[PDB]
Amino acid sequence: QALDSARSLTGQLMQFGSTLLGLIERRDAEAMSELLQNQAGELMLSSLR
């Protein structure tokens, strides 16, 4: 029964780990997508220039 209680918490820890990896990679996706846009802006500046 101690084993089952720990196995339940380890399953929940795995769920946290999956969600955390998802959020990490998703935040890094948003940061890149914003970097690309900032670059496109400071590049259209030279294009207009």
């Binding site: 802006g41 400071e42 500046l45 207009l48 220039r49």
Partner: protein, 48 residues
């Protein structure tokens, strides 16, 4: 200060054009408070 044909002997007024402005928009952090916990009560069931 023209010539015999009326063409100007001076150099024309040149004017450096303006550099097109860099666009800039407002970017603000989202703000919001947490939510307070609800009132507590002893349930019908034991803790486990």
């Amino acid at each position: 200060n023209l010539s015999i044909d009326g063409q100007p002997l001076s150099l024309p007024v040149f004017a450096a054009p303006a550099d097109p402005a860099a666009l800039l928009s407002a970017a603000a952090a989202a703000s919001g408070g947490s939510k307070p916990l609800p009132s507590a009560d002893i349930p019908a069931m034991r803790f486990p």
